[PDB]
C-alpha cells in the first residue's frame, strides 16, 4: 500500500476533474462564434524603428503612459525609449549581461530586470542627482528568472527556473509568499488587472492560476504537448492564452476550467515566443521563431495578418494600454513600433 | 521641434555615442561557455547564479561563463566556443557523459558552435588501467576488442596500454561529433589534469582556428 494506495486516489481524483470538465462543454466556442463578421485582413505597418541595441533583445515592457518603454538586450543595457520621438531617455548599465526579463512599474519610478544571475534588480529612475541607481537586489531564487511584474512600488512577483514563483516586499527585500506546485521550469507570467490573481505557464505543459493573497494553486490547466513559453490575460480577467513550443496557441477560461480555442496551422511548425492581446481582446498577437509575428482572431480562430519586419527571431511583444501601438523586439537588435 | 526636445534630442545623441563606444569594447572580447558534471572538475581548468571568469592569452580578452533540461541554452547562441569537461577517470558516468555530450552536439541552438573537449583527470585513468582496479571493458563492451591500440601514438612513453585506454575514451566522443554536423562545427579533444597549466593556450589555439574557419568560409577557401 502506502504509495500504491495513494496513487489510486490521485487517479480517481484526476478522472473526476475530467468528468466534471466534460459536463460543461455543451457547445464549442468556435461553433458559437460562427455568426459574427470576421475582422478581415488586418494590415499593420512599421511606423518607426528603435535602433541602438547591439545584441539580441530578450525582453521589452510598455509603460503605463504608453509612450515610455524599457528594453532588455544581451549587451548588458536597459534602454528607456521615447516611442513618440525615437529619443533615448535613459541607458542603464547592468551588472549582468544575461537578462531574460524586464519590467516597468505602473507609477514609472522603477524598472526591473533579471536573468541567469537569479536576482531581480530594481532600478530607481526618478531620483535626485540626475542618474539611475539600483535600489534593490532581490535574492532567494535558485533558478534563472524568466519573468517579473510589478504589483506596485513595493510588491513584485517573479517567475524562475527553480519551478517556483515568489512574491517580494521590495523595502524589506524578503520573499513574502512562495508559490509551489509546478513540475517543470516556469517560463512566463501574467497578472490579472485586479492584481488579486496571476497565472504562470511552465515547461511541464501546464498552466496554474495562483492567489497572491493566499499562496495556493487555485486551478491547473493541461492541454499542451510541449513547453509553454508565453502566457497573457484576456482584458476581461477571466481568461488567458498560452503560447507553446508545439506551434500551437490555446485559450483557457478560468470559470469553465478547460480549453476553449486552439490556434494552429499546417504551415506553422515553429513555436511561440511571446503572446499579447488587444484592447478589446478580439485580436491575439503572437511572436514566433520564423522571424515574424502572426495576428490571430481570438473568437474566429483564423489568421488575420502577419507582421514581417524582422530578420531574426521575434523574442518579445507588447501592446499599449490605449491600444494605439504594438511594439515588437527581436534578435536582430531592433525594436519596431507597428500601427 | 521646441527648445526642450531639441535639448532632449541632444541628450539622446550623447547616449548613442556612449552606446557605441562600449559596443566596440564588447566586440573585442570572446565569450566561452563552460559545461560539465559535478565530478568533472571544470573549475580547475584555467588557473585564473552565474560565475564569470576573466583571462587573457596573447593580449585578447576572453570571457568564460559557468552556470550553476537546459532551456537557457538559447542565450549562448553567439558564443565563440563551448568548453566541455569529462571525467575520464570515472567509468560509471562515462555513458552519462556520452549522452550529455550528445545533447550539446545535436542541440538546435548549438548547430554551428564548436566544442572544446577536455578529458579531465587523465592521470587518474592511468592508475585504473596500469594498477589493479575495475576493468574498463566491463562498462564498455568493446574495448577488450582493443582496436588499433596506439593506431598512431604521440607520447614519449607512458606504458602504452594506458594510451589505448586514453584513445578509446577519446574516440567515443569524436564518433559522436562526426556522426552529424556536416562540417559546420568541429570538436577539439584534449587530455587534461589538475597539474596541467597549458589549458589557457589550448583554448586560445582552438578559438584562433574557430574564427579562421568562419573567415575562410566567407572567402570559399575551406
Amino acid at each position, epitope marked *: 500500500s502506502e504509495l500504491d494506495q495513494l496513487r489510486q486516489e490521485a487517479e480517481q481524483l484526476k478522472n473526476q476533474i475530467r468528468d466534471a470538465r466534460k459536463a460543461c462543454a455543451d457547445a464549442t466556442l468556435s461553433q458559437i462564434t460562427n455568426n459574427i463578421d470576421p475582422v478581415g485582413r488586418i494590415q499593420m505597418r512599421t511606423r518607426r524603428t528603435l535602433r541602438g541595441h547591439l545584441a539580441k533583445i530578450y525582453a521589452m515592457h510598455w509603460g503605463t503612459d504608453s*509612450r*515610455l518603454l524599457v528594453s532588455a538586450s544581451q549587451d548588458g543595457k536597459l534602454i528607456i525609449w*521615447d516611442s513618440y520621438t525615437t*529619443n533615448k*531617455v*535613459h541607458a542603464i548599465p547592468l551588472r549582468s549581461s544575461w537578462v531574460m526579463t524586464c519590467a516597468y512599474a505602473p507609477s*514609472g519610478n522603477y524598472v526591473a530586470c533579471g536573468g541567469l544571475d537569479n536576482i531581480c534588480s530594481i532600478y530607481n529612475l*526618478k531620483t*535626485r*542627482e*540626475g*542618474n539611475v541607481r539600483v535600489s534593490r537586489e532581490l535574492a532567494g531564487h535558485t533558478g534563472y528568472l524568466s519573468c517579473c511584474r510589478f504589483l506596485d512600488d513595493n510588491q513584485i512577483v517573479t517567475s524562475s527556473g527553480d519551478t517556483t514563483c515568489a512574491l517580494w516586499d521590495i523595502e524589506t527585500g524578503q520573499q513574502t509568499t512562495t508559490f509551489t506546485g509546478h513540475t517543470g521550469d516556469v517560463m512566463s507570467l501574467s497578472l490579472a488587472p485586479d492584481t488579486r490573481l496571476f497565472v504562470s505557464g511552465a515547461c511541464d505543459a501546464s498552466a496554474k492560476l495562483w492567489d497572491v493573497r493566499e499562496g495556493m494553486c487555485r486551478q491547473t490547466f493541461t492541454g499542451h504537448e510541449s513547453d509553454i513559453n508565453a502566457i497573457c490575460f484576456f482584458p476581461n480577467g477571466n481568461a488567458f492564452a498560452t503560447g507553446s513550443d508545439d506551434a500551437t496557441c490555446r485559450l483557457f477560461d478560468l470559470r469553465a476550467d478547460q480549453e476553449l480555442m486552439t490556434y494552429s496551422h499546417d504551415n506553422i511548425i515553429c513555436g511561440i515566443t511571446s503572446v499579447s492581446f488587444s484592447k478589446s481582446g478580439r485580436l491575439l498577437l503572437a511572436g514566433y521563431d520564423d522571424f515574424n509575428c502572426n495576428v490571430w482572431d481570438a473568437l474566429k480562430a483564423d489568421r488575420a495578418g502577419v507582421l514581417a519586419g524582422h530578420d531574426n527571431r521575434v523574442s518579445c511583444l507588447g501592446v499599449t494600454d490605449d491600444g494605439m501601438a504594438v511594439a515588437t523586439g527581436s534578435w536582430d537588435s531592433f525594436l519596431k513600433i507597428w500601427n | 521641434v*521646441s*527648445a*526642450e*526636445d531639441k*535639448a*532632449a534630442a*541632444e*541628450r539622446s545623441k*550623447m547616449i548613442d555615442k556612449n552606446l557605441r563606444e562600449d559596443g566596440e569594447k564588447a566586440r573585442r572580447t570572446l565569450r566561452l561557455l563552460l559545461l560539465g558534471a559535478d565530478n568533472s572538475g571544470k573549475s580547475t581548468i584555467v588557473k585564473q547564479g552565474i560565475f564569470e571568469t576573466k583571462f587573457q592569452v596573447d593580449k585578447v580578452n576572453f570571457h568564460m561563463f559557468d552556470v550553476g533540461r537546459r532551456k537557457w541554452i538559447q542565450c549562448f547562441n553567439d558564443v565563440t566556443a563551448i568548453i566541455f569537461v569529462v571525467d575520464s577517470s570515472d567509468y560509471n558516468r562515462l555513458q552519462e557523459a556520452l549522452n550529455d555530450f550528445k545533447s550539446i552536439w545535436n542541440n538546435r541552438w548549438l548547430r554551428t558552435i564548436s566544442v572544446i573537449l577536455f578529458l579531465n583527470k587523465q592521470d587518474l585513468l592511468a592508475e585504473k588501467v596500469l594498477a589493479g582496479k575495475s576493468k574498463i571493458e566491463d562498462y564498455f563492451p568493446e574495448f577488450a576488442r582493443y582496436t588499433t591500440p596506439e593506431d598512431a601514438t604521440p607520447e614519449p612513453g607512458e606504458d602504452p596500454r594506458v594510451t589505448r585506454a586514453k584513445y578509446f575514451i577519446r574516440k567515443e566522443f569524436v564518433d559522436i561529433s562526426t556522426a552529424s554536423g556536416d562540417g559546420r562545427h568541429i570538436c577539439y579533444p584534449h587530455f587534461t589534469c589538475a597539474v596541467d597549466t597549458e589549458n589557457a593556450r589550448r583554448i586560445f589555439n582552438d578559438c584562433k582556428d574557430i574564427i579562421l574557419q568562419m573567415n575562410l568560409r566567407e572567402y570559399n577557401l575551406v
Partner: single-chain antibody
Amino acid sequence: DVQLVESGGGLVQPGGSRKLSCSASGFAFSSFGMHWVRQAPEKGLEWVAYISSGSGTIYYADTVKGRFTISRDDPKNTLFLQMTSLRSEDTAMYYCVRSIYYYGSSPFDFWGQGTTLTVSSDIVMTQATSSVPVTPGESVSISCRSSKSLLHSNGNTYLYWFLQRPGQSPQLLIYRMSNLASGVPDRFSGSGSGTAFTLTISRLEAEDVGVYYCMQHLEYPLTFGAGTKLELK
C-alpha cells in the same frame, strides 16, 4: 546633498574683467545643462547664458553677447563665466542654475547662491500685479501673461514658476505650467491656456512670502516676469 557653491564678485572698475566660478557637489554635473541668471538690485530676474551637457550648444543674451563667455569643466565639476569689458549695467547678483532635458524632466529645479558683482522677436512676460497684501489662511491667485502662445504642437506649454524668498535663492514650484516640482507642497497648483496663465495657492501659511517669477522656455532668449511681491498684513 545637492550644492552649487559660487565664487568671485567684488568691486570692479568699469572696463575691467572678472571670471565668476560655480562649484557643483552632490549630483552628476556632466549630465546637467547650466544657466547663469543675474538679479540687479533695482530690477528683477534676468538670464545671461546657457551651456548644454557635453558643451555642444551654447547660447547668450543679447546684452552680453560678444563680451561674456561661458564654459564648464566636467572633471572638475565647475562652470565658469568670463566677463569682459564691464559696464555699470552689469552690477547684479549672478546665480547658477542646473537643468536637465528629457521626457518628464524638471529643468531649473535647483539654484545656488550668487556672487554680488558691483561695477563702479523676444517674448515679453508681463506680471501686472507687483505688490499684493496677503493674510494667512487665505487663497491667493497669481496670473501671468505672455506675448505669444507658449503651447507647442507636441502638447507642451513651457511656463515655469519660481519663488524668491527674502535672502534666499529662487526655487522652482511648477514646471511646464501644470506639474508640481519635487519637495513642493501640494497646495501649489498651475493652470491656464496659451497667453493666459494662473498659479493658485490654497491655504497660504508662513514661509510662502516672496516675489513670484514667471519664466518661458519656448525659445531662447529666456525672459522672466517683473515679479509679484507678497507681503503680510
